[PDB]
Amino acid sequence: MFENITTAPADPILGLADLLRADERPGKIDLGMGVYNDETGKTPVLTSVKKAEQYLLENETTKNYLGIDGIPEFGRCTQELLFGKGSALINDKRARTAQTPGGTGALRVAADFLAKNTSVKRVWVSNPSWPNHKSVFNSAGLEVREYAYYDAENHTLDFDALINSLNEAQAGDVVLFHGCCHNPTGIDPTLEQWQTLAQLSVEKGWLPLFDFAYQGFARGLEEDAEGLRAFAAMHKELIVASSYSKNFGLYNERVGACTLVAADSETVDRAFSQMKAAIRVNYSSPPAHGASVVATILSNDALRAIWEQELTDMRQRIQRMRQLFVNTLQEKGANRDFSFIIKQNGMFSFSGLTKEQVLRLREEFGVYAVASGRVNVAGMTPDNMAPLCEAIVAVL
Amino acid sequence: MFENITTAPADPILGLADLLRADERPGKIDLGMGVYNDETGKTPVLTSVKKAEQYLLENETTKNYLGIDGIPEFGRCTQELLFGKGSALINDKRARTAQTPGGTGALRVAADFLAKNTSVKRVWVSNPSWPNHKSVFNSAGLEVREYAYYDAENHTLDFDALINSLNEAQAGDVVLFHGCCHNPTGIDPTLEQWQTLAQLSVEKGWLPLFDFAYQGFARGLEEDAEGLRAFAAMHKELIVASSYSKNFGLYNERVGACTLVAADSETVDRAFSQMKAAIRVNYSSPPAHGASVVATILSNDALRAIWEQELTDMRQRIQRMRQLFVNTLQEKGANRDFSFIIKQNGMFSFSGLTKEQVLRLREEFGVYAVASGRVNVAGMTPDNMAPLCEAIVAVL
Numbered sequence: 001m002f003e004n005i006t007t008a009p010a011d012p013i014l015g016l017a018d019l020l021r022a023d024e025r026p027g028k029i030d031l032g033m034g035v036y037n038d039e040t041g042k043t044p045v046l047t048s049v050k051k052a053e054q055y056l057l058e059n060e061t062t063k064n065y066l067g068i069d070g071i072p073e074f075g076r077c078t079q080e081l082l083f084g085k086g087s088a089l090i091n092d093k094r095a096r097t098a099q100t101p102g103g104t105g106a107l108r109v110a111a112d113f114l115a116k117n118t119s120v121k122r123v124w125v126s127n128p129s130w131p132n133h134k135s136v137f138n139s140a141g142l143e144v145r146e147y148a149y150y151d152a153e154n155h156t157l158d159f160d161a162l163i164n165s166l167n168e169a170q171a172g173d174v175v176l177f178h179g180c181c182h183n184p185t186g187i188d189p190t191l192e193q194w195q196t197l198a199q200l201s202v203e204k205g206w207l208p209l210f211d212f213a214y215q216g217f218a219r220g221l222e223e224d225a226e227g228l229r230a231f232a233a234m235h236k237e238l239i240v241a242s243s244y245s246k247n248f249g250l251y252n253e254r255v256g257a258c259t260l261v262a263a264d265s266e267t268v269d270r271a272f273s274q275m276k277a278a279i280r281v282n283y284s285s286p287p288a289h290g291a292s293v294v295a296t297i298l299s300n301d302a303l304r305a306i307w308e309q310e311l312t313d314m315r316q317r318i319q320r321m322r323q324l325f326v327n328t329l330q331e332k333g334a335n336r337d338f339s340f341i342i343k344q345n346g347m348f349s350f351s352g353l354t355k356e357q358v359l360r361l362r363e364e365f366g367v368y369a370v371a372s373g374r375v376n377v378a379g380m381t382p383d384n385m386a387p388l389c390e391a392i393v394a395v396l
Numbered sequence: 397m398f399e400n401i402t403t404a405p406a407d408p409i410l411g412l413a414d415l416l417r418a419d420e421r422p423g424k425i426d427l428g429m430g431v432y433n434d435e436t437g438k439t440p441v442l443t444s445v446k447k448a449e450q451y452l453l454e455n456e457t458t459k460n461y462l463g464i465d466g467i468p469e470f471g472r473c474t475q476e477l478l479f480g481k482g483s484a485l486i487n488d489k490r491a492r493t494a495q496t497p498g499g500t501g502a503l504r505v506a507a508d509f510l511a512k513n514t515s516v517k518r519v520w521v522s523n524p525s526w527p528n529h530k531s532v533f534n535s536a537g538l539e540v541r542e543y544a545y546y547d548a549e550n551h552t553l554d555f556d557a558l559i560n561s562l563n564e565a566q567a568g569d570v571v572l573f574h575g576c577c578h579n580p581t582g583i584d585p586t587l588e589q590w591q592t593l594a595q596l597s598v599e600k601g602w603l604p605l606f607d608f609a610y611q612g613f614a615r616g617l618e619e620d621a622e623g624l625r626a627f628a629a630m631h632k633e634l635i636v637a638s639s640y641s642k643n644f645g646l647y648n649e650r651v652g653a654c655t656l657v658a659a660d661s662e663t664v665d666r667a668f669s670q671m672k673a674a675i676r677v678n679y680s681s682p683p684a685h686g687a688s689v690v691a692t693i694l695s696n697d698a699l700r701a702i703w704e705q706e707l708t709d710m711r712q713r714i715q716r717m718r719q720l721f722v723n724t725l726q727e728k729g730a731n732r733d734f735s736f737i738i739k740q741n742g743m744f745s746f747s748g749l750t751k752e753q754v755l756r757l758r759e760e761f762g763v764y765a766v767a768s769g770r771v772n773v774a775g776m777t778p779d780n781m782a783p784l785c786e787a788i789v790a791v792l
């Protein structure tokens with residue numbers, strides 16, 4: 001039966017990891033991956049999280065199933081984080097949230113929900129975009145189209161081209177937006193550009209789907225959400241797929257959420273039932289541990305203060321490395337200008353390196369990056385900044 | 397967009413729970429649910445599990461992503477549990493295992509794998525069967541057919557009818573088998589019937605898919621696996637979807653596994669890559685906590701001894717309640733014979749009650765059971781055995 005099944009193609013990111021396995025050279029530098037690293041080059045467990053797992057270990061008295069939509073506390077604490085404490089969306093009960101196995105899980109759930117309960121046929125993703133986006137939606141039977149976004153020449157958001165390709169999008173189509181810290185360009189819209197997109201969106205009749213996986217890594221918790229909040233102010237219906245993998249360092253516990261917003265509570269409750277049905281035939285109910293931790297931290301004043309501070313330390317270290325990277329490049333006498341990376345947000349940025357330069361950095365310097373030129377700034381430390389930069393200057 | 401989405405039908409089991417919410421009567425008795433209860437009527441966390449979560453809390457130093465197939469230790473410890481320590485399947489590297497979010501998750505993964513990489517079109521499930529079986533496979537686009545299994549009149553396995561309906565199954569079709577503790581009849585094949593099915597299976601060219609969610613609840617760990625091991629001895633290819641929700645009391649941590657077996661390692665590795673691809677577009681990687689616990693217990697001699705003993709206490713309590721139930725019924729002067737429930741295994745058994753009797757027990761006695769007459773024996777205690785039985789005698 002499995003006679004002639006063809007081997008699956010190597011993943012553009014996960015497969016890159018294997019190459020690191022074989023390479024036994026000492027000084028290797030991993031700028032692919034996709035997770036946070038600290039000065040040491042490690043991916044530790046947050047203190048707030050350890051304290052939370054302590055609490056759960058002494059209070060849990062059962063591991064009985066969670067409802068299909070997960071922990072109720074996790075849900076409202078998530079909606080407050082996304083829309084704001086006094087948000088009208090919450091007061092009118094226009095939103096429902098399902099705890100999901102990661103942000104990726106929220107995307108699949110949304111995709112299954114849409115393909116089986118709506119007339120949606122096309123989804124628009126930015127160019128470039130996190131490769132897994134197209135895969136998840138295609139897997140659900142939806143076609144994925146692309147809209148201009150990145151200006152390769154000026155290393156900026158080509159707002160015009162963006163708007164010009166979105167016009168080809170009909171009413172009823174889904175348009176996916178990265179909430180903040182766009183993956184992989186690291187270029188996000190300005191608040192005014194967001195407002196312009198929210199209006200244009202309401203006119204054309206698009207269904208907005210926000211992928212919010214890095215809230216807190218651009219400017220801050222509240223600041224990073226004004227984009228999504230601008231859309232939510234004018235939209236009748238929305239879908240937000242969020243993740244806590246990064247801002248909590250809970251990657252392997254698979255902690256995310258899919259929030260559905262409709263015109264009124266009557267409607268959202270009805271649409272949500274079908275979303276719960278989509279989940280029932282997938283994994284049945286979400287894993288508790290990871291979500292349990294998040295809820296505990298967010299609902300406890302003390303613990304929430306510690307976490308916010310820890311989040312801030314992560315945000316600033318990345319902002320540090322961005323500056324230390326540009327400067328060292330000049331110090332080593334890098335060819336052209338790289339100051340544009342200081343204008344970008346989050347862990348990722350396009351280095352502007354050619355496929356061949358990436359290939360040369362890896363083969364001749366053990367420096368690992370995605371063929372696209374995407375580098376994970378969080379993988380840079382004061383220790384490897386010099387050997388790293390020197391190698392880059394060698395391939396320019 | 398969510399304008400006229402129709403409400404989803406109530407789930408046959410999960411929806412029954414709500415009725416318990418509204419009912420405020422004190423003496424209620426919940427025999428639906430589907431999880432284990434102890435003398436107290438609670439669903440505690442195993443001691444072995446608490447000790448394991450203790451260990452993980454002091455040793456975990458990162459929450460970095462697990463590989464798509466999860467924790468490697470979890471995988472081999474699972475294959476040893478299923479096939480036996482010296483199993484030839486393991487020595488020849490003919491099996492690959494993916495850690496999945498629950499047993500339900502393993503089923504969806506298998507379904508997605510089959511619908512996208514094989515010629516499979518039909519899946520055969522027993523009649524009756526765990527309702528969610530049909531849903532999961534239909535969701536993947538496969539059609540589900542049924543084969544006779546339960547003899548409603550004699551409360552036994554109608555082996556003949558079983559064989560007669562399976563003949564209508566063509567080569568290339570998938571046949572699903574409950575490893576042990578059949579849900580909901582509680583009737584399993586004898587070892588000789590298993591061997592007869594394994595042979596018949598190899599001749600007809602069926603692809604066996606075992607749903608193994610209750611290993612350890614019938615006779616014991618090793619005993620409960622001789623069925624699956626009988627098939628694995630003669631089959632080139634198999635698929636086992638197992639769960640640790642029950643024998644570990646880890647329901648909400650979603651801990652399961654999907655094992656793929658092929659003719660040789662070369663082939664299984666190729667087929668597995670596509671299975672990893674199916675997982676990549678679903679939830680990406682499995683949650684660690686739950687699986688981490690299982691691996692820790694199974695690989696530690698001391699802890700594994702404590703868990704086995706705890707498993708045995710669960711198995712025997714259920715065997716106790718089965719006897720205490722039949723006897724009390726006679727004591728209360730029940731109408732007919734119920735001795736057949738002592739011949740059945742696991743937490744479930746068909747009481748042989750009519751839809752109307754079930755409805756009457758619930759409305760007039762707060763006694764809750766599935767409309768099908770399925771009762772969860774693990775929900776009976778020495779405390780509620782009398783009020784329970786009296787009510788049953790009232791509706792006979």
Ligand SMILES: *Cc1c(COP(=O)(O)O)cnc(C)c1O
Nearest residue numbers: 102103104130183211213243245
């Ligand atoms: C990291 C990321 C996610 C979420 O991934 P998690 O493991 O699933 O929760 C989603 N979208 C993008 C663009 C991401 O970079």
Ligand SMILES: *Cc1c(COP(=O)(O)O)cnc(C)c1O
Nearest residue numbers: 498499500526579607609639641
């Ligand atoms: C309980 C059960 C499972 C597995 O469920 P879990 O929550 O998903 O792991 C699978 N099949 C049957 C028939 C079951 O009763």
